[PDB]
Amino acid sequence: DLELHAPSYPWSHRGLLSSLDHTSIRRGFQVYKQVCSSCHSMDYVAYRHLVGVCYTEEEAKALAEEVEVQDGPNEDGEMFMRPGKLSDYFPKPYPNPEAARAANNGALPPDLSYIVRARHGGEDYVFSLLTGYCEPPTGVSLREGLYFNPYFPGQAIAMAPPIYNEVLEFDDGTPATMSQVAKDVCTFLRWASEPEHDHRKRMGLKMLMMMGLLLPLVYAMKRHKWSVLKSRKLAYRPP
């Protein structure tokens, strides 16, 4: 059996009040679009959420119209195909779950809208997983089609190696090293799971400050109004 747990990587957003590197989010979206979107899906995230996080409005619009998304029945009686816009969720790669299972070896690529909030370990898992591919150890013979990943439960993941060195060209020009690609995609997936990650932390900061201020004064109020009982100095004078 055994379950090799993912080591705790020192992510930039790991800090108590540290938010994700949004430039890393911009880089991590491209790998999802050009690599992970080929078989996987992010159905719960639309192009609208992308603006203001790692893209501006015009780039988001252009990116959305790059793909083609289905709209409702036209005035003739059938589906009419239209380019995407801001209010369209990320395109599904496969028409239905059955098509997804059949197209692959027989497994199902889980949607990544929550894969970081569903896997025990979080980003440290996924990153390590994408970088955990290796030759199976002696005495283990995986079936044709199965690939060996120690971090995957059962060590028999049905995933072709998704990330290899120089898989795609980052627009800004950062090197396409597999480690960089995996790091950026993991940050992007964490953002996808927890979009409020920035604001939450920001809110927490304020909660730390004012409750560091309210708590003494309120306490200072209590000891103020409770001091009468705390300095009673009783006396007994029986006859």
Binding site: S19, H22, V53, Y55, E59, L205, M209
Partner: protein
């Protein structure tokens, strides 16, 4: 004493107490929000969208 003048001026009347509290909150929200946003952007510099907007 400054505290004594403060109390004799705008703390004796409970209604003036409320006015002081409200006008104080008016500026406290502003100052605290500015300061906390300042601390947050200083801690996370070069990572927030505001800091990297100018590139694109």
């Amino acid at each position: 004493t400054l505290t004594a003048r403060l109390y004799s001026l705008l703390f004796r009347r409970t209604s003036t107490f409320a006015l002081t509290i409200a006008v104080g909150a008016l500026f406290f929200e502003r100052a605290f929000d500015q300061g906390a946003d300042a601390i947050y952007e200083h801690i996370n510099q070069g990572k927030l969208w505001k800091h990297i907007k100018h590139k694109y």
